[PDB]
């Protein structure tokens, strides 16, 4: 924000948080399917008991 | 539609873009940041000097 004018501030900034928030996606996107795999182990498990 | 007027030297006719900083841009006149519209800027040595 201190090294360059605010008019196009706008366009520098909004390039980072648009790349973390889809790099934050990656994330999530994982754990989906690592959740759906614990699931089948969690319906198994539930079997032998 | 407003449009406003005045007079200023020759070298701070770049200082009244949006973002900028000096002795006319912040005592006298300063725009707003996210201004709309635009600037009609000419020279005139013929009258006023």
Do not use: H
């Amino acid at each position: 924000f201190s090294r360059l004018d605010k008019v196009e501030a706008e366009v520098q900034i909004d390039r980072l948080i648009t790349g973390r928030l889809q790099s934050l996606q990656t994330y999530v996107t994982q754990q989906l399917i690592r959740a759906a795999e614990i699931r089948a182990s969690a319906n198994l498990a539930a079997t032998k008991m | 539609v407003y449009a406003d007027s005045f007079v200023i030297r020759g070298d701070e006719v770049r200082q009244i873009a949006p973002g900028q900083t000096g002795n006319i841009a912040d005592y006298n006149y300063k725009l707003p940041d996210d201004f709309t519209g635009c600037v009609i800027a000419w020279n005139s040595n013929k009258l006023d000097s």
